[PDB]
Amino acid sequence: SVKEGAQRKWAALKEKLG
Length: 18
Known about the structure:
Inverted formin-2, 1 helix, rod-shaped, about 20 residues, monomer, about 0% strand, mainly alpha
C-alpha cells in the first residue's frame, strides 16, 4: 500500500523537474 502512494508522488516530482 505504502509503495503505491509513494509512486504517485515519485512521478509527480519527476514531471516537475524537466
